Design a protein around this ligand. Structure first.
Ligand SMILES: [Zn+2]
Ligand SMILES: [Zn+2]
Ligand SMILES: [Zn+2]
Lengths: 47, 119, 539, 97, 510, 182, 83, 99
């Protein structure tokens, strides 16, 4: 409970949180062959 | 009930009156033979449509394309200018997006003179 | 009436909907499908995704697969059968969605604890660097270094890179690091059951000692592999300064992020019970010793196997002795007022932190003093939990909670006397206490053998049940919080799209400030109860 | 035919048939209703005594076929042309720009 | 305005058995009971207001405007509402299954106590594409007896005993058969707890003991709120989540039945309005419910409220299961019993009479007396042909044999019964789309029946006829199919309705 | 106006057997939609053409003819932002309600995005601008902006009626009266 | 799902008595609904007896449709069927 | 009802019921045991298969997905009995037409 408009620092952290989320949504370029143990998945990972 | 698609090829209002004249011609053809529940849209359409351009054609319609071709006005504006506010100044200012913009002095006046060549 | 009270969504989604809610904000649609189904049905197979949902077969599955792999949202395992072929089963991976729920909170501690330097270009630099890390989910050094602009200082961003490895935080990508704890234990359990050349059928109990002891030492090398390794990071070729391996990639870690907030919980308890100075003296100690302190990592053997009835302690105390070992042996000898941003020796301020021990810390060995990570948790869970009832209900609810915790399992006879004042109001808050669990009810009749009324009653124990009810506070708080924030989007979606294209009118700017207000405050409420939940996830 | 001799008795009447209503019809009362709810059975409404409950048609005898009369409409008159549509519209944006 | 409505023929495929959880009933709620007891009567003209019985719930009388809908008995069917029950009162029928769901689950973690490959093997078993129902009962048994032998709890730490359900409707899990003469870590705390008890008052504990531990309906409901997702399949519950998983097996809400379930039994030899047993049940529930609701924060004590709440589970278990039984019976005990011989009813448009011979009637002909032919009707739709003669049947009157007792216009009136008057001019219009019921006459189709049916030759179909006196007379050529010795036995008579079924009987069953 | 493409099943009685199929299906389809509103596709006016028609089936207990066909019906909606002629009808203090004679009176534009100086008066004077003003019986050009769709309540044989409703924003100069120009 | 061509059929060329029950029933029901008649009608009453007369000259414009277990459909005309 | 002084009727037994089954007549059974005795209509929705009043499915308010059909009164009565006890007598529908 409690709270309210407290800790402007946390507000800045909240703003950053929103900004980081927006960058992920905009994004989907290599990814290479990494960690794939499946030949079927590795073929699809080529593109 | 099942729908096979959102929207087919765009139909403006010309042939509406033309093919509702066929719906006219079929049942009672209104005013002439005056001497169900389809009367709702029947009397409604023909009244609003015709009264506009009075105070139409056959060939010149399909021949109106000529200078309406070279223009980049695309689609949304194209089938729209057929009826509303023809051939005076700020009339067409509203309908077309970006409006005057690119070409101003002469070329747009070529639109006014030809759409004034309607009636 | 009208259902707007949200009674519809209230009953049917404990845990569950939490996961696919967060990934919905992350991605949505197909992404929420697979994970949501991965939870409900648990262990899942590639072909099995197609059968259930009819999810647009093989177009979405192969797309979502690699999408969940880069951010490692799925626990991957592959094996075979005695019949033949091969099989690949997926699990819900650790908590990777909680990290997505974290995000900037992690980067917060990253920025804040990166000082001992002073207000440098580091702020705008690593903010761009770290945000590129978590987003992609994996970062190779060279390909990332290629993203840096040319004709400038290349080691400016590498001024802190080898400083990103630091002590905790970012570590290297290694092999099987993502893997079910149950499965890796079983896979490592091979060469143990398998090992004997028809030795001898004597003392069957020696097969126990054989497999176990050999598994424990093989388990230790695996878990300590990501923990501390100086090979890759400390590489220092000539014609330069220390530079991390351009080949080996990196990843963030649970180590010092889960530690940083855990210390805060200790600080909040400290600061409450002592002065601001004492909290600082206790802080400078924890900052140096947090590296070798298991803390959050404590059980590490718990998930994936049995404990015992008999041998439970012989398991537990085996961990407790190594929880005795490392803190006692390794940790720092007495220092004097190390650096800091009161002259002479500050150990006198430790002595006032010494003479007063209860509830917490102050465990001393001759020659060396340190805070136990074992006996500290019970008094840590006590305080915070007691403050919860303090916040939610009035003062009356508090007093009775400990009254049951002083002695154990007694009737209302000595309770009415020894509690505070009045019968009727006690019965009132007794019903409010017994309202949701946590005191249970006793089991015994008075000379009726379970028959009828007037039997004796007692209030007793039930810790975990008085725990898990704080685990129900996890999702359903954040749920409506995040949901109606997301519902605030689609409602204003027509406005937001107009705002984005603009980046006019009196009333358009009004609702623009509206949502932004609600946005800010709702994220502040999120992080609030976020810190509350994190302390309740253990013991 | 099932490979074991059984049937005609309430203990042996449940072998093949998965229909709960017809089995609760002949002989049973409480169990089959609660048992099917427990195990969350589905099955189908197929047989005769099953259909006479819901009050629908039968899959045997007279109802074994579907009666049809066929229109046999021509494939010619079905298609008219779009009137004064694809002429002016598309050719307007395709000239000079 | 007035959005279009479309329709297509729909059959039925299968059903789905399950338990509605907490979403439906509150959303299925028209009104809320509240108040308490009585009938919740208004004291002026004595109607019902809110409470158990109420205008917008259902209608027990001919007028009774529903206000949810209109047209009363001839239109409205039934409406649903809910009831708030203080505390999660226990179930009745699921009680047997509630022991099983409480069996294979940890009391420590409130989680499944199985281990690795075991679970992995069984999870593969039931997912075999074909399965018999017997396979379900076999494995769900097996997996349940597998957790019996294991004395060791997994992660979540220490453990407990089994649950034998000792008592009724009282659940007690006895922690028992601990390792003999072997000290447990929990036992040292166990015996340590009682040492602080017997110290204060040694009298009572030694007097009676060894009752182990029970489980209250409230805490076992909170014990079911932990396990979600994971595997409920081994417990017999598959989740496509229309429902909230087995939190549903304990009563919280309740589906208060409409007045279409039970009405107020009409009149008496003396004027009055009488209640039915089911009405008394749930209106009593609101009392014993609100009893706990009212006193919490104000009065009473610990050990009083208890048995009253224990009395609540006795009421509901009695409610849905001078019998005083209002529910579980009428479903089980309605107009039938199976000894191997069932019971049945509902044959309309029929007649019964004795037998008598005749040489003159050809086979497939059966003579029906005109006296019972006056009350025996049949539907006829006049089109293009009947127009001539049927309009003459109208003016004829419902007295002589060739007449019509009813008329139905295509304009959909209530109905036109022609006895009381009219006729005459009414036969002048007679539009094509109407329907008129003519008296039974020659050239019709009627099926013959005898009550003690034996084989396929029992039910037959013949032509009808009109003759004098009173009797059912048929050709003496056949005494065989019905086994007719005459002697004045009884014979059934059934007349079809639609043209379809009529042509079906004579052209096939003939 | 626009042309929708939909499918449907038609039941033609024995009475229409004397005429031709295409003529029978026509009348039936006219009794189906006509003035009625079709969900989410907009409002429909008339019927255009008939396609795909195949052999119709027959159910045992009727004797009628059930045919499942697809056809393209003419519906109504210009597009998101189109301006179209009309005029007001009624009023209160919300905003003006413009009715296009020949389709519906459903169009209503409240005053929010309208010119900055517009206000309603209880004085029975409709509206005022800081230019001039107008009233009923005079033509009005209105632009479309927002569109909403809702379901329907059960019919009651002998308010919330937004079956089909459109609203817009007229702030761009030269709207509402056509005699300001010329 | 698709219809088997008129070329080859595994179905018996004759008709079941159950089929005749529906035919006379169906067609006669259409008569009460005021349909036309393709056969000469002598003066008489009822839909039933004029239906049997209609089948005598085989004027029924109906096509019998049968189903196999595998859903191979079928097509059968009443007129072509002989008994 | 049964007997006299109220009104009459007749009896179709299960012993007799098999006889009309042995003839293989479906149409006769549809008229006699449904139309001739008790004819009733029940409003049902495809989703959350249940019974309801008018155009309301109650618990879900749609009126879009509700389909009205016919069904014996004994059925509905049996359902209202079952459903009030804890069980789900859910119903799902499919179209006869369209092949
Ligand atoms: Zn009603
Ligand atoms: Zn456990
Ligand atoms: Zn519904």
């Amino acid at each position: 409970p409690i709270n309210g408009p407290i800790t402007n620092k946390e507000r800045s952290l909240a703003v950053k949180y929103i900004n980081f989320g927006k960058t992920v949504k905009d994004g989907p370029x290599x990814x290479x062959x990494x960690x794939x143990x499946x030949x079927x998945x590795x073929x699809x990972x080529x593109x | 009930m099942k729908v096979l698609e959102e929207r087919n090829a765009f139909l403006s209002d010309y042939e509406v009156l033309k093919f509702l004249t066929d719906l006219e011609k079929k049942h009672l053809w209104d005013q002439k033979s005056l001497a169900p529940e389809l009367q709702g849209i029947t009397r409604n359409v023909v009244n609003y449509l015709s009264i506009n351009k009075n105070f139409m054609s056959d060939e010149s319609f399909a021949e109106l394309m000529t200078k309406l071709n070279s223009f980049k006005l695309f689609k949304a504006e194209k089938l729209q200018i057929v009826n509303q506010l023809p051939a005076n100044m700020v009339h067409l200012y509203s309908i077309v997006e970006e409006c005057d913009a690119r070409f101003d002095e002469k070329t747009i006046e070529e639109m006014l003179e030809i759409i004034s060549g309607y009636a | 009436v009208m259902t707007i009270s949200s009674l519809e969504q209230r009953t049917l989604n404990p845990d569950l909907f939490l996961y696919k809610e967060l990934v919905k904000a992350h991605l949505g649609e197909r992404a929420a499908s697979v994970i949501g189904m991965l939870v409900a049905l648990g262990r899942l197979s590639v072909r099995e995704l197609v059968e259930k949902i009819d999810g647009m077969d093989v177009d979405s599955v192969k797309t979502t697969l690699v999408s969940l792999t880069q951010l490692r949202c799925v626990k991957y395992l592959q094996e075979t059968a005695i019949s033949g072929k091969k099989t690949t089963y997926y699990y819900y991976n650790e908590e990777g969605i909680h990290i997505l729920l974290y995000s900037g909170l992690i980067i917060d501690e990253i920025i804040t604890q990166m000082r001992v330097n002073d207000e440098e270009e580091h702020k705008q630099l690593v903010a761009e660097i770290v945000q590129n890390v978590i987003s992609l989910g994996s970062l190779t050094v060279e390909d990332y270094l290629s993203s840096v602009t040319s004709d400038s200082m290349k080691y400016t961003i590498s001024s802190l890179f080898v400083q990103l490895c630091e002590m905790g935080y970012l570590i290297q990508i290694s092999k099987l690091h993502y893997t079910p704890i149950e499965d890796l234990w079983q896979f490592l359990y091979e060469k143990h059951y398998k090992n004997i050349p028809r030795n001898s059928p004597l003392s069957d109990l020696k097969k126990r000692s054989q497999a176990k002891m050999n598994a424990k030492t093989d388990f230790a090398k695996i878990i300590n592999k990501p923990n501390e390794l100086s090979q890759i990071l400390t590489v220092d070729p000539k014609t330069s300064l220390r530079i991390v391996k351009p080949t080996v990639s990196l990843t963030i870690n649970l180590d010092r992020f889960m530690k940083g907030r855990r210390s805060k919980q200790l600080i909040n308890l400290a600061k409450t019970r002592v002065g601001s100075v004492t909290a600082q003296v206790y802080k400078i100690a924890l900052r140096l010793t947090e590296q070798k302190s298991p803390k959050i990592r404590d059980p590490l053997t718990q998930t994936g196997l049995l404990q015992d009835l008999e041998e439970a302690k012989s398991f537990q105390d085996e961990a407790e002795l190594v929880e005795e070992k490392t803190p006692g042996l390794t940790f720092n000898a007495i220092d004097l007022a190390r650096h800091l941003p009161s002259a002479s020796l500050i150990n006198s301020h430790l002595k006032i932190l010494a003479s007063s021990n209860f509830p917490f810390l102050n465990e001393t060995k001759p020659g060396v003093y340190y805070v136990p990570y074992s006996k500290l948790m019970p008094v840590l869970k006590s305080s915070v939990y007691e403050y919860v009832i303090a916040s939610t209900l009035g003062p009356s609810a508090m007093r009775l909670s400990r009254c049951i915790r002083d002695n154990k399992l007694v009737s209302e006879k000595i309770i009415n006397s020894t509690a505070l004042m009045k019968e009727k109001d006690i019965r009132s808050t007794l019903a409010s206490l017994i309202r949701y669990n946590s005191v249970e009810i006793q089991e015994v009749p008075r000379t009726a053998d379970r028959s009828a009324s007037r039997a004796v009653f007692l209030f007793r124990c039930k810790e975990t049940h008085s725990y898990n009810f704080m685990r129900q506070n996890l999702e359903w708080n954040m749920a409506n919080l995040l949901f109606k924030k997301e519902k605030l989007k689609q409602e204003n979606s027509t406005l937001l799209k107009k705002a984005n294209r603009d980046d006019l009118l009196p009333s358009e700017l009004n609702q623009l400030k509206m949502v932004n207000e609600r946005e800010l405050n709702v994220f502040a409420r999120l992080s609030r109860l976020l810190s509350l939940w994190e302390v309740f996830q253990m013991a | 035919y099932k490979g074991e001799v059984l049937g005609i008795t309430r203990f042996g009447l449940s072998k093949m048939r998965d229909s709960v209503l017809q089995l609760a019809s002949f002989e049973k009362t409480t169990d089959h209703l609660f048992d099917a709810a427990f195990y969350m059975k589905k099955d189908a409404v197929e047989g005769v005594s099953e259909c006479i409950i819901l009050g629908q048609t039968m899959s045997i005898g007279t109802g074994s076929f579907k009666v049809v009369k066929g229109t046999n409409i021509s494939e010619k008159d079905l298609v008219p042309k779009r009137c004064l549509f694809e002429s002016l519209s598309n050719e307007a944006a395709l000239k000079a720009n | 305005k007035e959005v279009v409505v479309s329709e297509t023929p729909k059959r039925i495929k299968g059903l789905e058995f399950s338990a509605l959880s907490a979403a439906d009933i509150v959303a299925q709620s028209e009104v809320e009971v509240s108040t308490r007891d009585l009938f919740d009567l208004e004291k002026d003209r004595a109607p019902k207001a809110n409470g158990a019985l109420d205008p917008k719930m259902g209608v027990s009388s001919s007028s009774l405007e529903c206000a949810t809908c209109h047209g009363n008995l001839a239109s409205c069917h039934g409406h649903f509402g809910h009831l708030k029950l203080a505390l999660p009162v226990f179930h009745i029928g699921y009680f047997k299954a509630t022991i099983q769901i409480l069996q294979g689950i940890c009391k420590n973690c409130s989680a499944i106590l199985l281990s690795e490959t075991d679970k992995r093997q069984f999870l593969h078993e039931l997912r075999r594409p074909g399965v018999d129902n017997l396979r379900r009962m076999g494995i769900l048994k097996k997996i349940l007896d597998q957790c019996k032998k294991q004395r060791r709890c997994l992660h979540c730490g220490a453990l407990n005993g089994v649950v034998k359900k000792a008592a009724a409707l009282k659940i007690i899990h006895d922690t028992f058969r601990w390792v003999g003469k072997k000290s447990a870590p929990e036992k040292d705390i166990w015996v340590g707890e009682w040492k602080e008890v017997l110290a204060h008052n040694p009298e009572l504990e030694r007097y009676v003991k060894r009752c182990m531990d029970d489980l209250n309906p409230l805490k076992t409901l909170n014990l079911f709120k932990q396990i979600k997702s994971a595997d409920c399949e081994l417990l017999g519950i598959d989740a496509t989540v229309p429902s909230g998983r087995p939190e549903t097996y304990i009563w919280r809400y309740l589906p208060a039945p409409p007045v279409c379930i039970r009405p107020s039994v009409m009149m008496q030899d003396s004027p009055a309005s009488n209640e039915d047993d089911l009405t008394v049940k749930l209106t009593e529930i609101v009392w014993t419910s609100s009893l706990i609701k009212a006193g919490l924060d104000k009065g009473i004590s610990i050990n009083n409220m208890m048995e009253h709440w224990d009395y609540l589970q006795l009421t509901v278990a009695m409610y849905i299961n001078k019998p005083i039984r209002g529910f579980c019976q009428r479903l089980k005990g309605k107009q039938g019993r199976f000894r191997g011989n069932l019971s049945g009813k509902r044959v309309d448009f029929s007649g019964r009479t004795v037998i008598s011979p005749d040489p003159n009637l050809s086979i497939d002909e059966v003579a029906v007396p005109d006296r019972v032919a006056k009350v025996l009707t049949y539907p006829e739709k006049v089109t293009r042909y009947n127009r001539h003669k049927l309009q003459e049947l109208i003016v004829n009157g419902p007295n002589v044999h060739p007449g019509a007792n009813y008329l139905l216009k295509r304009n959909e009136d209530a109905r036109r019964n022609l006895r009381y008057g009219d006729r005459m001019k009414l036969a002048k219009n007679l539009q094509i789309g109407d329907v008129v019921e003519r008296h039974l006459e020659d050239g019709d189709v009627v099926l013959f029946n005898r009550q003690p049916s034996l084989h396929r030759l029992s039910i037959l179909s013949h032509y009808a006829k009109i003759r004098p006196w009173r009797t059912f007379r048929l050709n003496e050529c056949v005494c065989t199919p019905y086994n007719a010795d005459f002697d004045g036995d009884e014979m059934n008579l059934h007349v079809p309705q639609t043209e379809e079924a009529r042509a079906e009987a004579i052209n096939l069953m003939g | 106006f626009i042309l929708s493409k939909i499918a449907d099943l038609v039941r033609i009685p024995p009475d229409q057997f004397h005429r031709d199929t295409i003529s029978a299906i026509t009348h039936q389809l006219n009794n189906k939609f006509a003035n009625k509103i079709i969900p989410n596709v907009g409002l429909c006016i008339t019927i255009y053409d008939l396609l795909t028609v195949e052999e119709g089936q027959l159910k045992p207990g009727d004797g009628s003819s059930y045919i499942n066909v697809t056809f393209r019906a003419v519906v109504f909606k210009p597009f998101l932002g189109e301006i179209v002629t009309g005029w007001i009808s009624k009023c209160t203090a919300e905003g003006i309600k413009v009715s296009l004679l020949g389709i519906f009176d459903d169009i209503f534009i409240p005053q929010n995005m309208l010119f900055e100086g517009c206000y309603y008066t209880p004085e029975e004077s409709a509206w005022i601008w800081p230019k001039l003003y107008f009233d009923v019986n005079e033509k009005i050009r209105f632009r479309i902006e927002r569109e909403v769709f809702v379901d329907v309540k059960p019919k009651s044989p002998k308010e919330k009626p937004p079956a089909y409703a459109l609203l817009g924003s007229c702030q761009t100069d030269g709207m509402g009266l056509v005699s300001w120009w010329e | 799902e698709k219809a088997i061509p008129k070329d080859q059929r595994a179905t018996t060329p004759y008709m079941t008595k159950y089929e005749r029950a529906r035919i006379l029933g169906t067609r006669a029901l259409q008569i009460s609904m005021n349909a036309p008649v393709f056969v000469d009608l002598e003066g008489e009453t009822d839909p039933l007896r004029i239906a049997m007369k209609e089948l005598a000259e085989k004027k029924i414009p109906l096509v019998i449709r049968r189903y196999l277990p595998d859903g191979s459909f079928e097509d059968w005309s009443v007129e072509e069927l002989i008994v | 009802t049964e007997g006299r002084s109220r009104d009459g009727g007749l009896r179709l037994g299960e012993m007799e019921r098999d006889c009309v089954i042995a003839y293989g007549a479906s149409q006769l059974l549809l008229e006699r045991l449904m139309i001739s005795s008790d004819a009733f209509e029940v409003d049902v929705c495809d989703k959350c298969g249940l019974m309801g009043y008018s155009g309301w499915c109650t618990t879900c308010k749609s009126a879009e997905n509700i389909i009205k059909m016919t069904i014996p009164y004994a059925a509905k009565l049996l359902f209202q009995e079952l459903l009030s006890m804890n069980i789900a007598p859910r119903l799902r529908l499919e179209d006869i037409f369209q092949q």
